[PDB]
Design a protein around this nucleic acid. Structure first.
Lengths: 58, 60
DNA sequence: CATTACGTAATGA
DNA sequence: CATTACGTAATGT
């Protein structure tokens, strides 16, 4: 009957949506980790370049 | 007290709504953090390049 | 107490 | 079809 096949299609889609949202969350936390170490390396670079500018003698 | 099953269910349904609200807010705040770090890394990269061009200009 | 998989029905327009 | 909120039950996330 149509009811059971519509329900099974949705039951499959709800699982798929949930697995996909779990995937995006892992990917988003990865992204926060990569952007944060990039941020820290860029800050080290700025500090080091600023210090050279500030102490250049010629 | 009487009907402990319904007491526990009523309290758990509260915990569940609370947990789901919090998870949504954690999700928002994480996306905002990605935005923030992305725009800050952009700013930091322009700074590295503008400092570098200044050193290049001064040294040769 | 907080967290999460499950099936369902509504939303989406 | 994809997404979301719900209440339940199991479980220590």
């Amino acid at each position: 009957n149509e009811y059971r096949v519509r329900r099974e299609r949705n039951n499959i889609a709800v699982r798929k949506s949930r697995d996909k949202a779990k995937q995006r969350n892992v990917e988003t936390q990865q992204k926060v980790l990569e952007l944060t170490s990039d941020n820290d390396r860029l800050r080290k670079r700025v500090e080091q370049l600023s210090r050279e500018l500030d102490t250049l003698r010629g």
